[PDB]
Amino acid sequence: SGAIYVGNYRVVNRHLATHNDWANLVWEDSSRDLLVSSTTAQGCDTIARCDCQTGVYYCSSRRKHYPVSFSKPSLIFVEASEYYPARYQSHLMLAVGHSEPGDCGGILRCQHGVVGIVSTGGNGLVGFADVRDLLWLDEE
């Protein structure tokens, strides 16, 4: 589990969104596994605005943060997981690393802020849903 809290936005994996998230929806995209809901309280996370390909992610199933290199956001074929069939997922970045379903929502961060959240795992790879292109998170 996990979210990003920026301004009056909460960013979560679409497959983990709550009723309250859907009841306060701003934007969602199944192909990216993202959903954004509105918040009453201001959040303090900063979204990275950059093309970094190195950073650190949180892996809850190891209670550890791992430094990783990660690929550019792309349309990637993902094998079946416990929460999606095998399919193409968009805006996804891969690294070599551990990721199980409970790790979804863990933050990937670079020097500029939050890059994205864990979304995929298996075959020794971890996939992150990028948020750096969602420039509207920075305003309004």
Ligand SMILES: [Zn+2]
């Ligand atoms: Zn960066």
